[PDB]
Amino acid sequence: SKKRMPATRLYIKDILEGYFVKSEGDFEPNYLITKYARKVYRAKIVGTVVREPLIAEDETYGKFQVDDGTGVIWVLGFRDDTKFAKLVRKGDLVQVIGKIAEWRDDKQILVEGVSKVHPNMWILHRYETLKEKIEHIKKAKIALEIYNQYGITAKSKVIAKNKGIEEELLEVIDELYGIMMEERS
Amino acid sequence: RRRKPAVERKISEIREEDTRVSLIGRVIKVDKMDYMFWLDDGTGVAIIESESDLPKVGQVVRVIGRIIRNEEGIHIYAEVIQDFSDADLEALEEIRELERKLLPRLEGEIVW
Amino acid sequence: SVLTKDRIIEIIERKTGMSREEIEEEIRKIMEEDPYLSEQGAAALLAERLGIDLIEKEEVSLMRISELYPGMDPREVNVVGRVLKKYPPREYTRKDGSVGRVASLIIYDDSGRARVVLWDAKVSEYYNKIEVGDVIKVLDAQVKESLSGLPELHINFRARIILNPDDPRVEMIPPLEEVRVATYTRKKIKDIEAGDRFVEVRGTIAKVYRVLTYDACPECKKKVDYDEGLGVWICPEHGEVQPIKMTILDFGLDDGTGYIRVTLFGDDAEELLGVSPEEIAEKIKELEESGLTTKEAARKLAEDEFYNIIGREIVVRGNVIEDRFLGLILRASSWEDVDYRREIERIKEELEKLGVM
Ligand SMILES: [Zn+2]
């Protein structure tokens, strides 16, 4: 019953280029679906802090800019989560994990943890991020062919099971198609 | 208009269109009077004008900064200088080649 | 129901090693003395003279050591295991002045290992007779669980032990010669199940639950229990000992494929936090005085002082146990820094499977 979704290791560019879906239901969290149909709940980025953190006088909010090469994202913490902005400085190589949030139609990360990492960890991060992107795109390429031929039907769910494809992946492609059709109009 | 990302490039691969670059190399000479240090990554040598933080000669560092293109020449105004002495440069070069060949291919695979 | 004529012959063949023709001659000799006996009854009388007729004392079961769970009904406990280790017996002075005894025996089967804790008279009754290699039968013991994820069979006044029993599971236990030290196996959190042992998981800290200290043995670094009826802290391996402080670190790990609660112990937890356990105990005391409970103080200290460890990639190694209220807990005995060069090679192998290299 109590399930925690795992953080997906992604590039900053993929998070910025994705589509934020704010869940209206109380028992549903906010998720971002990237251009390659990847339903991501928590973000896991590794980059360099380009500017000195902005800490308020009354310690109500703390924000800092993170740059991994692909993009620059904002990392925010409020009230007690301001302690995360104090740990970092301008020039630190850190790993940030948190929930994806959208403020004024701009993507940003609500910090849950941030810590300094070794330069070899940044190399490792690029290896894992590239690897997971290859794995997901190859699975979604086959699932795209099943969705373009049958759609979301009882017959298509059996064919996807035989090809090593999860049922949720087909529903994410349909959700992405609906978002893209709204943008065309 | 969002702040431009540090385009990770080599010293030989510096395109005129680049504004902010990520150069990873070894320091070969340090001038404390003019606050500038020479960086060598294996493809070329560039002058790095630092604000106040001056690294040691021989220390491998990662420098993120703005390209200063003027009548004086082409140098890098340092903003961030990280310690890459304990970094596996062979692994860094291997993932650079993997990203150069796979990332542009993966970008256009799922586009509708 | 009583055993059949052929079943008695089969048990006499196994317990005496005599041939079926030899047993049939001895049954005929008994029926010659008393012709009023049946072919089944003569075999029963033959077994009684041999000393095998105590066949009605059959307590056979198929319970493995892995199936033992803390807080179980002692009556349900019926496991068998060969003695691998024998620890020296220790003594403790009770409240009434009497000196009690306690001895630990590490046993094992084809599934896992367990710690047998002998208490008072059970030490002089069994320990002297028990040798390394003998298979014992643990019955009616109280099952507890150590912090490392190892089950404990506490042999009290209700518990019984059978030296070398006639049980079918005894043949399935591998010999002492074949027993090797199990190394840690790499496994993703997505594939982690309850009851897994010796698992190496590489992940990132996503949240810190509690930071608190526990009283432990100053020699083996194991949790000591406070006996209120005696007034002493008794280690289930070194008897009456003076307890020392050791750190417990509850946090969450995230490898991209799953999430799991991890718990750290003593010297390994102090290494990750950077604060000594004596200083952590003092910080907990200060929060308890302010009106917070033991669990509230541990949760507050973790979020207000040890929030910096969240986001660091670390490697943990331990057993996965299933708590009745906290779900899956990977009780990591040891932790180490990520070998980046080794972790890159694991990725390269998976890239070759996809068709990248
Ligand atoms: Zn002890």
Numbering used by the authors:
A (entry chain B): 1 to 185
B (entry chain C): 6 to 117
C (entry chain A): 2 to 358
What's the publication's text?
Replication Protein A (RPA) is a heterotrimeric single stranded DNA-binding protein with essential roles in DNA replication, recombination and repair. In Archaea, the same function is also fulfilled by a heterotrimeric RPA. We report three crystal structures and five cryo-EM structures of Pyrococcus abyssi RPA (hereafter referred to PabRPA), in its apo form as well as bound to ssDNA. We find that archaeal and eukaryotic RPAs share a conserved heterotrimerization core, which is composed of three OB domains connected through a three-helix bundle formed by a C-terminal α-helix from each subunit.
Most of Rpa1 (2–358), Rpa2 (1–184), and Rpa3(6-117) subunits have been modeled in the electron density map, the only flexible region being the C-terminus of Rpa2 (185–268). PabRPA contains four OB domains, named OB-1, OB-2, OB-3, and OB-4, which share the highest structural similarity with OB-A, OB-C, OB-D and OB-E in eukaryotic RPA, respectively. Similar to the eukaryotic RPA, heterotrimerization of PabRPA is primarily mediated through a three-helix bundle formed by a C-terminal α-helix from each subunit. The trimerization helix of Rpa2 is followed by a helix-turn-helix motif, which stabilizes the Tri-C by extending the contacts between the Rpa2 and Rpa3 subunits. The N-terminal region of Rpa1 hosts two independent domains, which adopt an extended conformation in contrast to the compact structure of the Tri-C: the OB-1 DNA-binding domain and an archaea-specific helical domain named AROD (Acidic Rpa1 OB-binding Domain). Interestingly, in the PabRPA crystal structure, the tri-helical bundle simultaneously stacks against the OB-4 and OB-1 domains of the neighboring Rpa3 and Rpa1 chains, respectively, through a crystal lattice contact. Interestingly, the same OB-3/OB-3 interaction forms a crystal-packing contact in the crystal structure of full-length PabRPA in its apo form.
